[model samples]
Structure formats: C-alpha cells, structure tokens
Target: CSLDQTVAPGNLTLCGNATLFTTFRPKARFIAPEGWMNAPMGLYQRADGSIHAGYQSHPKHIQWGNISQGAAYSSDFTSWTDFNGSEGYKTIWPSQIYDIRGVFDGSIIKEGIDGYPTILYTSTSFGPLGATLNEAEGTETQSLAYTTDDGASWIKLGYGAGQNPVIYEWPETNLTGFRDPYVFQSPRLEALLANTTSITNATGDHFATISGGVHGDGARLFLYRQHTTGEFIKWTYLGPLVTTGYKESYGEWSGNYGINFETAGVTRLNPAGAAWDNGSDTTAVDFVTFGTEQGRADHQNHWPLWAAVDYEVRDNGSIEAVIAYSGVQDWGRSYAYASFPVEGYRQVSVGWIYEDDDNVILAKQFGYQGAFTLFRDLFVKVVENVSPSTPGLFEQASWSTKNSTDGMSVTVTTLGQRVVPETLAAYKGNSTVSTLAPVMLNESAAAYTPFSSQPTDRFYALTGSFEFGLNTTAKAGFRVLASEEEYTDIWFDPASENLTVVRTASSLIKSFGNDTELAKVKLYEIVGAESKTLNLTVFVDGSVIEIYANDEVALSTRAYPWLANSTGAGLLADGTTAGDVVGVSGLELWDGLVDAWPARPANTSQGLVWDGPTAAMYGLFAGY
Candidate 1:
C-alpha cells in the first residue's frame, strides 16, 4: 500500500495509507479504529457533551510505521465512532512546523480564557543525525492546537519561527527524550507553598508538565507554569517535579505522564526493577503522591510510589492490607496504558492490548473509574461494608460452612472460615451447601459446595488457607464449576509447590491455556516452619480470575465458560484419591462483588466472556 495525501481547508498537509486488513471488533470496550496504535493523546470530553479521543494510529498496519493522530467521538463511552471511516483517514496528521515527522503523546484541557478545548502534544521532525531543529541531532518540541468547532476540526496554533511550535528545547540541554505533555490549571506556586518554608517558584498559576531529562542523567518530569490561562507562550520552567538519584526505587526516568488533581498526584512508568519490567523493557504504569508540606520540589517529603490499588484480606475481622501494585499488572504483554481525570469523581483511561503471539496486532483498551484507577499512592481502601470508595458492583455478605466427613468440623466467624463442588451425580452421596449465603468448608475428604443459588449472576471473592496432605499428589483449593465434566481448578500442588489455575476443561471454546506461577510461599520453611500451608485470596468476576497468594504474589488470567450457568464454585481435596487427607482449615467466599468495573460484562476482550455472549473485547482486570 502506498501513501495517500490530502490538504485541509487552510492548506494543512495530512498523509496516510489504506490497507486490506481489518482490526478486531470491540463489543463494549473502548478501542481505536482498526489499526489504532497507542493510547489516545488528547483524551477529554468537550463542552458540547461529546467525548473526544485523539490517538496514535497507523491505518495501514498495526505497528508504528506510519504514525498519525486519529480522532474519534462518543456520546456514551461504551460505543465510539471513528471520525474517518474504518478504512480512511479522519485523523489530525502532521501539518506545518516541528510535527512534520509525527505527532506524539499529548493532553487536552479547556482553555480558561475562552473555554475552547485545547491540546498540547509533543512534536518531532527527525532523521539520520541531522534534524532542522538542531542541525546535528533529532529535535522534539511541544506544540499546540485548538478546536472552535466543538472538536469536529482543529486550527493549528503557532509560535516562534514555526507555525505549530509552542515550547522549544534549551540550547544547553539535549531534549530528544521530552514528550507526553499534560497541562492543567493549578494554583500559583506561591499559594501552593504558603504553608511551607522551602520550595519557592513564582512562575505562573497554570501549569504544563512534560516528561524528559538530561541526556545521560535519564528522563525527568519538567514543570512549566504560566501566569495567564490562554496565553501559553507566557509560561516558564518551574523545576523538575521530583528529584531522582537515577535509580528505579527513587524517581521516574522515562514516565511522569498522567496527572490527577483530585487526589493531587501523577501516574508514571513503574520502577525499572518492577515485575512488569522483569523480562524485557515492557512498560506499565504506577503513581506517586507528593506532600504539600515540602511543596513540589521536596522529594524527601513524598510517599513511596504505589500501585494504582493494593489488595486486602480480612484477618480476625480486621482489614489487613496486602501490598500489591495500586494499578494494573503486566500480563507479561501489553503497553501504553495511560489515564486522565474526568467528571463525576471519576476518570477515563486507555492503553494498547497487544495480541499474545503478535505485538503488532494491537487493540485499543479502556475503562472509566476513580482517578488513577488501580494504583496505591492515592485511592487505596479497605472496605468492611457493602459501599466501597472505588467504582464496581459489589455487596458484602456473611459466610456459612459445612464439612460432612468424620474427624473434621467447619468453622465460620467474621474473620474467616473453611470452604466446594461436584456434578449432580457426584454430589448424590455428599451433603451440599447452598450458595444462598457465604460458605466455608473444613478440609474433610474432598467436598463440593455451591457458590450462589443464582449461578448466572456471578461475581465473588474467596480468601483462605489450604493445608497440604502428606502425599505426592496432594492438592487442595477451589474448583470453578460449570458441571462435573466442565470445571476449572485453581489449586496448589504440594509436590511442585506451585499455585496453579487451569481453565482447560471449563471451555471447549479453544486454546485457553493453563496458567500458573510459583506460589508466593514456596516451602514455608522461610518462616521457620515446615507446615504445608498456603494462603490465597481470589476474585472471580465472570471471565477473569485474579488471585493473590499470601499477599506477596498475584496472578491474573482470563477464563471463558461456554455454559450460561457456569458460576458454581466448589472446594476440592485431591489427596483423598492419593490415600491422603488435606483440609481447608479456613476459607471465606462472597457473592455479588465486581471490582474496578461497574457492570458484569463491561470490559471483555477476545478471551474474556460474560453470561452468554462475548460482551467485551479485552480482559484487562484490576483489583485491590
């Protein structure tokens, strides 16, 4: 496919190409048009009640080969209309000035002066070694554009010698790494630090924060504040938002991208040593909260950068926090997950969900929830009641347990309890506990207890410990039930000491692999004990099963059950078949709880599922 060129009303230049390929279709999830590349640059709702998302797109292919800024609109976030038809280019492409090569990450905000929607993005024109901005090195400059036609089209705003340039690089600093501009209205530096004794900067009331750094020193978040609202040209540099010692644990070198004003924080790339960056240079998001006492310049006064949300398990009826990332975890693959604040005490976010086998065949991923949806620096909670601080569909319930086997008794308390399943024939001789209320099972010979009376209304939480029997085949944990022949197992194998979740039998759909990882508590010898005990807290909401083992490790994977009434959850003890006996010791399960997402099938992807349909296009699940 060759490139197609077009000219806009003002002789604005735009270029793109067409292809024969069509991207995957999204049911309810928000994604870019076919071949959309990255997270939207300017993601915001305009004054005319239309949500506008400007994203990186390559209409011809999935890679970043032919980068262009594409626009899409949505009245209800559930469904979107790509501006250019599915195959054409209705994008904001490079025109005059520094963006000739391509336009990059940017943000959208309402202009305080005229209430017109404005965008500030990073623009660059580079090739080989000689770029016009520097004559010897590549150049990345901040650029601007405004829309007076309610986001239908934009007028390229210019400054300096270029028509679209807003902020250029410092002659003394190498700024090729600078980009992802996020602008917002903030109070003057003097007023924000009136209560503090240090950190002085009387720049401007309005601010634009960009991510970049000195050449060898690594990337840093730079602050540019402006005194006036509409006049962005009057802004000046305040300082780097946070100081870094050039290490992963202390500061961000590449990402200080999304900012949230409600909680007073920002989201950036996870630390270098974080699990997401384990295998390769794959990137994920994390957030940090700064203290008002020391102001913006004081790094020693900030809380440790946290995940979007942290997990929790109730111990002795008291909420015990489990340390985990506050935001979404790397599923070993995926990229460009960024978010921005929105109305109604909420925010909307976007990312690229890449195919497991092919990174180039990417699909747009998105969701709307509390600001900074999954990280811990802000919006962390421990809920003891039905009402939660974050968005979701959940309710609290009491638990009940039953163990019919001899020499075993089930216990249930506000703190915890022990918890099962089988086909109708398999349950003929066994006493079954109804899912009318919460259920617990004492580790008596293997057991099957129904989760909820209404099996179709599936969403719940399970947390407890499993005791391994003295057999090589000893296995004890929960079994997700569709029927006796169609059930998935999430259990611990003592022989291998591996915590595993298998969906091999749950779906006849195709290729749903068995996913497992080493349990957080390997031998249990580190605690000076040889007890074969493993603690696990799990969340099962439709197609996604999120497990947190011992609060030290988390494994989140997708599962799709072909049956409509597939919500039954059962307890199992395979040691019985191996002439061994293992018990639940203590387990607790709850029903009618959905985390992160507000509806049952709100955000489902290809491998994800709902009651009877493929309700969504992605299985990006976030939990505590």
Candidate 2:
C-alpha cells in the first residue's frame, strides 16, 4: 500500500497455456510480473533457442525501490514466461559488498565460444541510482556473472570466484555516472571503428565494451577493447569514443549515459527476402539512427534507455541506416527498426509503460496488491493495399440527435452508431463498417454526445474538433469506459490548451503522471489559432490507446478495464454559457482500420489493450 517498504518478489509465471495464437491482453503488453519495473537487462536468445530476459523489479508497488534484477523467457518475443522458482526472484541483487546496496542496468550476452549465458552488469555500494547515489563516493563498476546451466543458476566470474569488483573504469575520468555496458563482437566493433583513422584493420574475434559515463553537462561514451579469445580478463582502454564533444561545464568530465552499439550490414538490415537468398555487404554503423544526419552517434536525445541500428543498401546502391531508441517514460521509439523487415525498408519499435493514474483506483477498488506497468512489442505486417490514404465514407455518417444546452441550443449527429459493413467480418457481431463517417453537430454552445460500436476492441479512426470560444472550455475525444465508474478519459482540454489523458478514475493501480497535471499535455500541434480541429486517428488494440493527431502529435497511453461489461466509448464538450457557444463537429469515425491488429479480432499481436474483469490481464488470453 505504500512506496517505502521492500515488498517480497512475486512471479509472472510462464503458465504454459499460451500458444502461437494467444488471445491479446489489451492493456498489459509484454508480460511483467505484478510488480515489474524498468527494461529487461537483456533480451537475448539462448542456446536452446528460447529467449532469456532480465529486468529491474519492485515487487510490491509501481514505485522503483528495493531494486533487483528480474528474469523471464519467451519462445516468441510476443509472449514471455517470467522465471520463477530458483532462476526467478532477484536474478541478480545486492548480496555481495560490491553490489551489497543494489544492482542497476547492464546486459546479458550469449558467449559465442562456450555457449554459456553470461551477464555483464553494473552495480554499486550505494542505496539507489540517481544524482545523489551516483555522485556519492562508492564503487560503481561493470562486473561479470555467468550461468552455465542455461540461466537457472549464475556465478560471478572474477576475483576469487566473484567476490571483488571487476575494477573496470574509464581512464582519466571521475566516476559519477558509469553504467549500462553494451558488449558485442568484432564485426560490430570493426564497423564502429572502421572509419577511425587511429584504429585500422583491428579485426577478428575482438570483444568490445561500450559504457555510458555521465558527469558534467553532457553524456559521454567510453569504449574498451579486449583481444583475448578464450577467457576475458584484461581490457585495453581506448580513450573516450566521441560521437561529438561537449566541453561546457562541471569539474572534470561531462559525458553520456546508457550508450550501446549495434552493427548491421545489408543482410542484417534486410535478410535477403528469403532464407535461401544470399547477399554480401559490409561496414557497420549505429544499430539505430534518427534524423537526417551523418555519423553513427549523431542525433538528439543522448543516453536513451536503449538504442541500436541496422543498415540497408537501396536499389540505387546507396546505403541507409535505420535507427531506434527507447528510454524512461517513452517506451516505443523508432526510426527504422528490424522486426518488420520487408521490401524496401521499415521501422518498428516497442515501449515499456508502467504506472497510470488509473492504477491508483485499481488498488482502492479491487484490493489488488501489485500495480505495475504493461509493455507491448511492436511487430506487425504492413499490407500496403488496404491502407487508407484519405478519410472515406465511414467518417461521413453524421446526422442530428437529441441534445442538451450550456447556453445555446445544439443538435448532435452520430457516426457509425449503426455498423457499416466493409470487410467480410464487418458485421460479424455489432461491428461497424464505414470509410469516412463524420460527426456534424449543429450547435451554438457546449453540448456533447458519444458514438461507439458499443462493446468491442477493434480498429478505428476518428477526426474532428471542439470549437473554442471566448469563455469556452471544451473536451472532444474518446472515453474508454470499463464500467460507469472506471475508465480512461482521453480528450483535448481547451482549458489547459493541451491534449490530456487521465486514468485516475479507472483503477487503483496508481503510478507516476496519472492525473490532471502530468496527464495534461506535452506536445501541442496546432499550427495557428484558426486550426482548432483535433483530428485524431486512434488505434485500439486490446489496451493500448495510440492516437495520431494531425500527423504532428502522437499520444500513446494505456488503460486496464476490470469489469466484464467495461467497454464503452463517448465524446463530450464544456464551454461558456454566455460567450460564443462551442461547436463539436466535423468528427469522423471508421472501422476496418489497417497496418495494426491481427487478421482476426481474437488473434493476439504485440500490442496490449485494456480488458475488464481479470486480476491478471494475461488471463484474457484464455477467455477470448
């Protein structure tokens, strides 16, 4: 019930009921135990072909405290079996003096030679990681731990069988923020160094370790190279690897945080159409890149939680690199990701979401113990043929309806209130079918109405506005109601001049940024005062509500509906009773959406949507 105590660890058991076609868990994305937090230390493939993942865990609440490493395995990245029993709990914790206080972020790599699962992690003698503990005088170094029996049991590798710290630190630098090791082979190593004049032809079997060191003004990257093959002991400090330079402020150093590497050739970027197809290409860059810039480490937003890139050779012989990054708060970020490798090139990304205002209600209402965040992997097939280029007829179905008044009288019209048949499964249930159905409300004041397919978790697109007036206060968007008492309120708040989404009323599982202020808004996208239309295309796959507004702003949020008949939708408006009346119109809604959702409604993809009536959101996998 509180964020202070260290709650005992729990398991997100790999319950053996899921399949290649598991039902989607609308809200909880990638499976996290009830109290899971942060990204997995490693999302690596093991010898047995099953994937192993490790993460930061906070068992009792959504707050990050009593930190420890967590583990889970997945056959497909889509569904995971969180390691319980022996291999579970704190896979790595603050047990020894080196890490007696805590274990932070690091990585796990599958050694190419012996085929053992090795963990390279960062830990400290300090209590927690941040400005305080980081700046404190304590040992913060990268250590080595390995597991010979898959990942069930791990042993520290150095200094009397893992008693002392490995003692790896950046030369000539003060240690404040030195964490998150990114280790890879020489192929990826040679690519990052291929262009450096000082290091040439330093090829074959060399291991590279890149770390993020944060001290002064900017985040810095430190690179280490070890040439040994069998057992790794000594590493050659290759100075500071500069993507760019920052010589601005603070005492000794000004550097980076959580910097990692990824190497990709044409084949890595685009795997030869089919496995039988072979192609040869060389040269490596950042695993992921963003913006129209050159250089592997050239871009904005340094020290992401994770970043990687892959390269692709175009039909014109010109090479292109697709970059991706994910950090705290923003789970899904990408430029050109590798998962959906198709024809020319495509980008894919997934995010980690925890702590919604609604979780607060979840605790209060349901008496559940663990309130955690949900994450979804971003993997989908793009069918270019059926993609909508324009808002079609389904959005044009606006007509007058019963209305109320704030000041002036108004007439509300409905869009897709009656299901429009488009696909063969359009009217399968109470499904709606239409291309461009618009909501045209003839009103001089504030009046709102709701339009929905009633009870469904299908794909749809909506575009429209909440006209602002002198004293006008309006909200026109979608309401995801689990029941009369629980729901996520997603709308455009003209009063705050921002787009807001609040899960405060929904559940008791409260976490950060759940209410009015934190949820008020971030990126505002109206070009001018005249452009008042909050045109939005919302993607509802299970529990994820991804809204693309005017192609300029993207707001992605999550909700958990815990009632059987929890699915409902609506639109509302509030404005001045005396000044110019607000008009809620030019609204369009449609079904048969594309580029998202699996072929069948019950089919699960990487996206997590909200479902009502289950303690474990994953439980929905069986019911649907």
In terms of lDDT, which candidate is strongest?
A: 1
lDDT of all predictions, in order shown?
0.43, 0.40
TM-score quality measure for candidate 2? 0.53
Q: Candidate 1 — which residues are off by over 4 angstroms?
A: 1-26, 48-50, 84-89, 112-114, 128-138, 159-163, 170-176, 188-190, 193-203, 250-334, 358-624
lDDT (tens digit, per residue) of candidate 2 on 232-291: 545455554423223221111111232222211111222212111122332111332111
User: How well does candidate 2 score on lDDT at residue 7?
Assistant: 34
lDDT of 1 by residue, 1-624 (tens): 221112111211121122211111222234443443554567776776666777676542334433567776665543356564433534566665578667776777676325677777777675431111223234567777777776667666754553457677552365424566777542323333334322332344456666544443433556666544346555566556533332223112112212211112243232221222211332332333221111122211212122332212122111111222222222212234345554442333344433321221111221111011111111212212221111111111111122224423322111111111111112222222232332233335545554434233445556667655433466667776456556677877777656666666765434333334233223222222234556776655455455655433345444545444556776666544424555454455555432222232432222211222221222111110
- The regions of model 2 sitting more than 4 angstroms off are 1-27, 60-66, 87-90, 126-129, 133-138, 160-164, 185-189, 192-214, 229-231, 239-351, 356-451, 456-477, 482-487, 491-567, 570-624
lDDT measured at residue 476 in model 1 versus the true structure, 0 to 100: 69
Best by TM-score: 2
- Separately for all candidates shown, the number of backbone clashes (residues 3 or more apart, or on different chains) is 42, 65
